[model samples]
Target: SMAALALWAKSGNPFHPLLAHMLDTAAVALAVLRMEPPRTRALYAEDWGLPEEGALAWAAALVGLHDLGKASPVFQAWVAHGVFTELFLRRLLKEKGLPERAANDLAAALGAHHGFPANAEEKSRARRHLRTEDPLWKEARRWLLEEVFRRLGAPLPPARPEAVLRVMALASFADWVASDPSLFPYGRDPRRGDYLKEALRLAQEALNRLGWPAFAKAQRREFGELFPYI
Candidate 1:
C-alpha cells in the first residue's frame, strides 16, 4: 500500500514540505492584505463581489493555491520536488460543486505562477509525464486543496482577469517571502495542529523585518527637489 506523505516544495538542506509552504504563503498573503490601504482591500472585495472580510479570505486562499501545481510527479521527480495534473484538480473542484468556469479559471490561474499558463497541449504533455491516475497521488492533492480552502473558509471568486492578476501578484510575492530560508527556516511538521497559526506569526515577522507596506509614502515634488544635482 502506497501511503501519501508530504511532498517537497523546496529541496536540499532542511527540505520544505509543499503543504507547509502553501500555508506560509497564505499567511504572508493575509499579512499583506492587512497592511494594504482600505481602498485597495475594497477593490478586491468589489472585484470578487464579496464583503471585505470574505474577499480577504478568498484572495489569500487563492494566492495559496498558486503553487498547487507543484504537487505533480514531474516536479517531484525533478527535486525529489511536484502537481500531483490540472485536469484532475479541475475535476476535484467541480466535484466540490464549484461552477465549471470557476474550476477552469482557477486551475489556469494556479498554473500561471511559474510563467504563462500552460496551453491545453502543454497541460496534456505535463500529465503524460506523471502517474496522474494513481489514487495515492490524487488523495494527497485533494487533501492539500481541501486543507487550504477549509482553513481560509474561502468561497469561489469570480473569473475576473483583474482579480486573477491581483491575486497572482500577491501569491508571487508571498512565495518569494515564504521560500526564503532565512525568513522561514524549514522542516516543520506539516501535520501540526498549530502550524497555520505559527505560519501566520512567522509571516508577520517577515513582513515587519522587510518593512513592507511601511515604505515612505511618495510626495509630490519639483524635479529639482527630487534631484537637485540634475
Candidate 2:
C-alpha cells in the first residue's frame, strides 16, 4: 500500500499509528543537508559524480530508501492485511538471478534502521518478506529508487563512516519528527498524495524556529535554496 501511515501497536488492539516513516526521514534529512557545510555537500556530490542539484536528490533518496524493508506486509504485520512479500519473492529470487545473500543484505539494512543488530534469524526473517510483487514495492523501486538513481546518474553510497552515520542521524530525526502524532496524526488520508512535501515544509519551519546564529547574506541565500519552504 502506498499509504502515508501504518499501524504501530502500543498497548495491543491494533490502532497504533506508524508512519510512511521513510519519506518523513527523507524530509528531516533535507534539513540536515541544508545545515551542512557547502564544501562537504560538494565533496559528497563529487564522490557521486553528481552536480549539486543531483547530490541533494541523492542524499534525500539515500536517506529515504533505508526503509525499503518496511514496505512489506511482514514488516507491518502488526496491522496491515496484504502479504505480498511472501508472494513476490517467489519469483524475484529466481528471476533476478541475484544471489540470495544479496537479498538478505538489502533486507538487513532495511530492517536494521532501528539498530536491529544482525543475526541469522533476523536476516532470515527479513529475507522471507522481501516482496517484489506488491504495487507499493514496484512503485518504490520504479518511481522512487530508480528515479533517484536516474537523477543521480549513479549509485554512490557514502564511503566515510561519519557520512553514513550522519545520514542515519538525519533519517532518524526525520522519523522522529514525522512520528509526532500531534503533527502527522495516524492513518492514510487518501487526499494526501505525497506527504513528504508537507513534512519537509514543516521540518524546515520547526528547525528554523530553533535558535541559531544569524547567517551572512550569502549563507542566508544559499540556506533559502536548500530549505525554501519558508
Candidate 3:
C-alpha cells in the first residue's frame, strides 16, 4: 500500500498508526513460533533451509507483505473505514523481469489471504464493486493464487492443517498484539503522511519490548536483503 492509506487511524492513538498492527503481528509471530509444534518449525526450516536468523527474516517479510491486499479499495469501502478509488498494486507488475503469470499468481495469494479463495464468484463481485479496469483486478487476482501461496510456504509439502493453522494463527496473534490499546489504540486519520515508517517504528518497538533479538536481525534483513528489490 502507498503512504496514502498507510496509517491505522481507526485506532485513536495519534502517537502511532499505520499498518503497524501488521508489522507488530509479523514480529510477534516469530516469537510466538515457540508455541508451534517442533515438527512444524523443522518442516518450515527444511523448505527454506536457512538459519534461524534468516528464517525469521523471511517470515517477517512474507507476513509483512501478507496484508498488502487489504490496502485495496474494495476492502476499505466495504468496511467504511475510509474511501478512495484507484490502488497502487499494479505499479510493479508490468516490469520485464516479472512474468504476467507470476504477477497474476502473487495478486491472487494476497487477495484471499484472510481466507475466502478468490474464485470466479468473488472475482465477479470484485469487478462489479471495486476497481476492475485493465490490470487492476488482474493484479488483485494474483494475490490469492497457488503461485503466491507456495512462496508463503504452503503444505503440498504436506504438514497437515494444524501446522498450517499455527502459522496463520501466529499472524492473527501478531495482529491482536499490535491492536493492543497501548500500542495502536483507536482513531481514524491519515494525516501523518509517512505511516509506513510509523508502522516500522511501532512494530520494532513492540518487538523491542518483547526482547526479540531475532526481530533486530529481521529488520536488517528487511532493509539489507529485501528493500534492495525496490
TM-scores for all candidates: the values are: 0.77, 0.54, 0.46
lDDT of each: 0.66, 0.45, 0.40
Superposed Cα deviation of residue 28, candidate 2 (Å):
1.9
lDDT of 2 by residue, 47-145 (tens): 445676666666676555554444454554432211222223223333434345433333232334332335555445445545343555544433334
Model 3: per-residue Cα lDDT over 178-222, one tens digit each: 667665444423244454355546655654554455333332111
lDDT of 1 by residue, 158-201 (tens): 45665655655566678778888788878876678888888888
Per-candidate clashes, comma-separated: 12, 0, 27
* Highest TM-score against the true fold, candidate: 1
Which parts of model 2 are misplaced by more than 4 Å? Answer: 1-20, 77-117, 129-162, 187-196, 209-230
Worst 10 residues of 2 by lDDT: 4-13
TM-score winner between candidates 1 and 3: 1
